[PDB]
Amino acid sequence: KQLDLSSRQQVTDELLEKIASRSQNIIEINISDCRSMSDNGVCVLAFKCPGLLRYTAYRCKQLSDTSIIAVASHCPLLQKVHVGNQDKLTDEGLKQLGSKCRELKDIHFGQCYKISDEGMIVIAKGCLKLQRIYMQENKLVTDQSVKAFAEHCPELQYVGFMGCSVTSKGVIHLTKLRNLSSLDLRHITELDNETVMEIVKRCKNLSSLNLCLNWIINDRCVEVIAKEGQNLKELYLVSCKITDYALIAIGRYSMTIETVDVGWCKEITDQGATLIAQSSKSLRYLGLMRCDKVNEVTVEQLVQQYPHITFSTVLQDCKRTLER
Amino acid sequence: KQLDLSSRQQVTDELLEKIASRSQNIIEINISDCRSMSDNGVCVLAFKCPGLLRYTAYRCKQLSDTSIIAVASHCPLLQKVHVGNQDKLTDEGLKQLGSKCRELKDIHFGQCYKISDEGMIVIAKGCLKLQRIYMQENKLVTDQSVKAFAEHCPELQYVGFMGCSVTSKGVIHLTKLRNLSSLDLRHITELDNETVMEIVKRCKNLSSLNLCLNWIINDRCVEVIAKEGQNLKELYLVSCKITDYALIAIGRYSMTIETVDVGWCKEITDQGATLIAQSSKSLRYLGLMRCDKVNEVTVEQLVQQYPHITFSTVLQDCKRTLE
Amino acid sequence: STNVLLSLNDQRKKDVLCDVTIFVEGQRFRAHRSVLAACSSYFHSRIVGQADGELNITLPEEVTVKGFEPLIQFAYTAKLILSKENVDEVCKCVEFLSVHNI
Amino acid sequence: HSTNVLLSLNDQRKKDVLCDVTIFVEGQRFRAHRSVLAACSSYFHSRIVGQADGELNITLPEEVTVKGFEPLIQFAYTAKLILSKENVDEVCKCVEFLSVHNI
């Protein structure tokens, strides 16, 4: 019913014969950080595959593509396929995974640099019930996986594209569907202000926007996301060449917000932060860090002045740890 | 009569008024690394300057150029001018120096990066008795600081311009005078093989060439320097992009030399040192440096192989060095 | 603070109360959440997007374990220790571990 | 090993005896040998190899700072450095450099 055999190291080699000794309803296979079984060790169980739903294997590097072939060839039913950083996983097996079970709804194939395009076409054609998308710094995934991937199944809610080789020419097309909730465009190539405006206005129902480690975005794109982003609740600004004036802009023109992450910004204004401290009503996220340009009056006084701010600097994540 | 007041710090500020009382034969003024005397304190002695010959002053940072004006304008006879690390040495001072005292025969104007071109021509028209010319990484020393000097004094011996801002064309010119003895090129732009060919076939007498820290030089230059090198006695090959093959050529084709310096070369071989040990009695350069990978065979074999030699390397110098 | 830095340093070298786990070539460093955020912008890129109690990170095959080992002590102690055998891969003083533009 | 030679030379240096080349920085004298500084810093071989004198006196430009300078010789000798975050910038070259240093 619930395997959760994660981090079993070298303890599970042939045992699975009695866990499913009579079993016909295993749906919670999580063997993450497996280091014991082999291709035989997965193929013995893969013979039956009774209605698997949450197949998952993180960093099972030693397992091969025959594992995915057998596990997708023997149960037409699947609900979660979040495999991990496991390498030497070609795209031929993913072809069969798309061909057999055309009902999968959630995927995660980060750190598998063998799925550049063919995996995208193959599980974009037949399978449609997909919901969540997350990938990692997997290059050679060209811009063909974005234009063509918003074409087929428009109900997807989570999208993950950090560190991939996709062009903005596909980012143009994500304004299609209005079901999307999360973006992970970390490491992208200069989405325009017009692009950000179109994707925000069409996709009114949007929750989380990533855009981490993007240099080329000016302050103006952030200046203008907030004028129309209503249900957006968190933005992840890291290493962007912003001028730290859109802070007051989002404190003026945006009221439905509680989480905002300013990453490695070279210039951080102190008075603008002072104004945002009392600008909004839902902001207590003062995880002050890398604070070379800070005084000893606000950070000394707001500790007792505002009992609704906890702070999380390296100075803070020691008392809490000592308490436990 | 013999000052040699170097490294005297703050002991001497005004006492020099007692040295120059009846003595009129001051030739051995030497106040290098001075840190006490000032403009007037040196001007009082420079007031007289009786027949000065060997003026030397290294690293007198506080020294002014009016002092050089006074020491040059009160004695037209001068023979050694070894100044040093004194900064802010104007090019006006050299002007009157070379105008007034037209006998000087030895100079040291290193590390004064504001005497780039003018001082050359100044003591290049008039002064003709110069013998030793020495500079440093004196910036802005152009090629027009070179050609317009070697046409006036042909008896040069030491030519010192390490790390300057000149090109190969000027050094092509120095093939004219035929008494040059030691050459001090550092950081030049590719003195060619033909150029060294002519400078050596023309200037037969030549003791030392540096070519220290040249990256553009090849192995064929040293290949051929031993084809005609009769009187050459030392080569200073450092950081040179050689193929480490000219060594056998110079060990075969040269019969009068004792020093060959292969310094910052990324390749050092034991076989080369072994061959140079006995191939020539004169060519002995087994002073291994920057040689990490080596066994303890030398210290166990060459003791009885060479029992009558006390050696000269930093490795073996354990006897005198303690004293 | 300074003694705070040292206390965090020891707690790291207790193998107890460690948040972020760095996975390089099977080897697993265990360090905190805030410190690696202070160290290299590459890591703080991959952390702050999650509030999960336990985290996992892998690094590119280009970054070498031999040069990787001293970096953690660098981050924790803010101290410089180097040897002549292992310099080239760290030749920017922004420590330039392979890819690795901050 | 030759590192034994290096350590022996280092200990001899740290007695103010058997020291051959003397460095002068605004008055401070730092004594060392003749071969090793030639092997270490290419600015120094320039001023060294051209002479065969007894006692040498090499001065350094203001561009080179003392505070970074003491560990330079230490890393030349034993290839080990001590340094914290406040004094880094005038050393950030990772090929030593720091001197002229167009190679």
Residue D83: list chain C partners with CB under 8 A: 79-80
A203 and A304 both lie in a single domain: no
Q: Is residue C59 part of a domain?
A: yes
Q: Is residue C101 part of a domain?
A: no
Q: Is residue B15 part of a domain?
A: yes
A321 and A277 both lie in a single domain: no
And the tokens for B196? Answer: 């060294």
At C58, the amino acid letter reads T
Gap from A212 CA to chain C (nearest CA, Å): 7
Strands of A84-233 (E only): list them: 208-209
Residue C34: list chain A partners with CB under 8 A: 289, 312-314, 317
Give the containing element (helix H, strand E) for A261. Answer: strand A259-262
Residues 6+ apart with CB under 8 A from A320: none
Maximum Cα–Cα distance across chain A: 68
Place of tokens 């803070």: A316
The whole-angstrom distance between residue A178's C-alpha and the CA centroid of its chain comes to 19
Find the closest chain D residue to C87 by CA distance. D94
| Helical residues (DSSP H) of chain B, grouped into ranges | 16-19, 39-46, 66-73, 91-100, 118-125, 168-173, 193-202, 219-228, 246-253, 270-279, 298-305
Q: Is residue A66 part of a domain?
A: no
Point out the residue among D18, D46, D103 whose CB comes nearest to the CB of B163.
Answer: D46
User: Residues B210, D50: contact at Cβ < 8 Å?
Assistant: yes
Rounded-to-integer distance, Cα A59 and Cα A112, Å: 10
In D50-89, the residues whose Cβ lies within 8 Å of chain B are 50, 57, 59
Structural biology method used? cryo-EM
Q: Name chain C's partners: 3 or more CB pairs within 8 A.
A: A, D
Q: Is residue A239 part of a domain?
A: yes
Q: Is residue B258 part of a domain?
A: no
Distances (CA, A) of D58 to B29, B208, D22, D28, D45: 22, 22, 6, 12, 11
Rounded-to-integer distance, Cα A258 and Cα B301, Å: 80
At B261, the amino acid letter reads D
User: Is B51 part of the contact surface with chain D (CB cutoff 8 Å)?
Assistant: no
Q: Is residue B293 part of a domain?
A: no
Q: Is residue B222 part of a domain?
A: no
Rounded-to-integer distance, Cα C46 and Cα C57, Å: 8
Residue D103: list chain B partners with CB under 8 A: 215
The end-to-end CA distance of chain C, in Å, is 25
Q: Name chain D's partners: 3 or more CB pairs within 8 A.
A: B, C
Residue D34: list chain B partners with CB under 8 A: 314
A279 and A300 both lie in a single domain: no
Q: Is residue C11 part of a domain?
A: yes
A222 and A251 both lie in a single domain: yes
| Helical residues (DSSP H) of chain A, grouped into ranges | 16-19, 39-46, 65-72, 92-100, 118-125, 144-147, 168-171, 193-202, 219-225, 246-253, 270-279, 298-305, 319-323
Q: Resolution limit in angstroms?
A: 4.1
Residues 6+ apart with CB under 8 A from A324: C17
Rounded-to-integer distance, Cα C63 and Cα A137, Å: 15
A136 and A266 both lie in a single domain: yes
User: Is C2 part of the contact surface with chain D (CB cutoff 8 Å)?
Assistant: no
User: Is B210 part of the contact surface with chain D (CB cutoff 8 Å)?
Assistant: yes
Structurally, how many domains does chain B consist of? 1
Sequence length of chain C is 102
Cα-Cα-Cα-Cα dihedral of D48, D53, D57, D62, to 10°?
-30
Rounded-to-integer distance, Cα A249 and Cα B123, Å: 70
In C61-80, the residues whose Cβ lies within 8 Å of chain D are 78-80
A177 and A300 both lie in a single domain: no
* φ, ψ at D32 (rounded to 5°): -160, -165
Find the closest chain C residue to A235 by CA distance. C49
User: Residues A53, A82: contact at Cβ < 8 Å?
Assistant: no
∠D60-D63-D66 over CA atoms, to 5°?
65
Rounded-to-integer distance, Cα B94 and Cα B135, Å: 14
Residues 6+ apart with CB under 8 A from D51: none
* φ, ψ at C43 (rounded to 5°): -75, -45
Strands of chain B (E only): list them: 54-57, 80-83, 107-108, 132-134, 158-160, 182-184, 208-209, 234-237, 259-262
Residue A171 falls in which region: left (phi positive, over 0), alpha (psi -120 to 50) or beta: alpha
The end-to-end CA distance of chain B, in Å, is 32
Rounded-to-integer distance, Cα D73 and Cα D10, Å: 10
Q: Is residue A201 part of a domain?
A: yes
The three-class DSSP label of residue A57 is: strand
Distances (CA, A) of A319 to A315, B321, C7, D81: 8, 61, 11, 34
Point out the residue among B59, B213, B294 whose CB comes nearest to the CB of D2.
Answer: B294
Gap from D40 CA to chain C (nearest CA, Å): 12
Burial class (CB in 10 A: 0-12, 13-18, 19+), A80: buried
Three-class HEC string of chain C:
CHHHHHHHHHHHCCCCCCCEEEEECCEEEEECCHHHHHHCHHHHHHHCCCCCCCCCEECCCCCCHHHHHHHHHHHHHCCECCCCCCCHHHCCCCCCCCCCCC
In A7-46, the residues whose Cβ lies within 8 Å of chain C are none
User: Residues A51, A75: contact at Cβ < 8 Å?
Assistant: yes
Residue A290: list chain C partners with CB under 8 A: 38
Rounded-to-integer distance, Cα A128 and Cα A105, Å: 7
Residues 6+ apart with CB under 8 A from B234: B207, B208, B209, B257, B258, B259, B260, B261
Residue C83: list chain D partners with CB under 8 A: 79-80
Q: Is residue A137 part of a domain?
A: yes
A205 and A249 both lie in a single domain: yes
Rounded-to-integer distance, Cα C11 and Cα B213, Å: 51
Cα-Cα-Cα-Cα dihedral of A148, A152, A155, A156, to 10°?
-40
User: Residues A292, A268: contact at Cβ < 8 Å?
Assistant: no
* φ, ψ at A251 (rounded to 5°): -75, -20
Rounded-to-integer distance, Cα B195 and Cα B168, Å: 8
A202 and A225 both lie in a single domain: yes
Gap from C82 CA to chain D (nearest CA, Å): 6
A300 and A191 both lie in a single domain: no
Q: Cβ separation of A59 and C23 shorter than 8 Å?
A: yes
Q: Is residue D79 part of a domain?
A: yes
A190 and A139 both lie in a single domain: yes
A158 and A264 both lie in a single domain: yes
The three-class DSSP label of residue A87 is: coil
> In which domain, by residue range, is C71 found?
2-90
Give the containing element (helix H, strand E) for B264. Answer: none
User: Residues A73, A48: contact at Cβ < 8 Å?
Assistant: no
Rounded-to-integer distance, Cα A53 and Cα A34, Å: 19
User: Is D2 part of the contact surface with chain B (CB cutoff 8 Å)?
Assistant: yes
> In which domain, by residue range, is A154 found?
131-283
The three-class DSSP label of residue A252 is: helix
Rounded-to-integer distance, Cα B93 and Cα B100, Å: 11
And the tokens for C98? Answer: 């392979």
Give the containing element (helix H, strand E) for D49. Answer: helix D42-49
Provide the 10 A C-beta neighbour count for residue B313: 12
Q: Is residue C95 part of a domain?
A: no
Structurally, how many domains does chain D consist of? 1
User: Is C11 part of the contact surface with chain A (CB cutoff 8 Å)?
Assistant: yes
* φ, ψ at A191 (rounded to 5°): -65, 135
Point out the residue among B59, B212, B261 whose CB comes nearest to the CB of D59.
Answer: B59
Q: Cβ separation of D45 and B263 shorter than 8 Å?
A: yes
Q: Is residue C96 part of a domain?
A: no
Gap from A258 CA to chain C (nearest CA, Å): 15
Q: Is residue D100 part of a domain?
A: no
Rounded-to-integer distance, Cα B28 and Cα B243, Å: 48
And the tokens for A18? Answer: 């009695």
Q: Cβ separation of C83 and D80 shorter than 8 Å?
A: yes
Residue B33 falls in which region: left (phi positive, over 0), alpha (psi -120 to 50) or beta: left
Provide the CATH number for the domain around residue C15: 3.30.710.10
Exposure string over B122-141, b if 16+ CB within 10 A, otherwise e: bbbeebeebbbbbbbbbeeb
The one-character DSSP state at A209 is E
Nearest CA-CA partner of B97 in B135, B52, B139: B52
Which residues sit opposite B260 in a β-bridge? B235
Nearest CA-CA partner of A103 in A69, A74, A79, A73: A79
Q: Cβ separation of D83 and C83 shorter than 8 Å?
A: no
A149 and A263 both lie in a single domain: yes
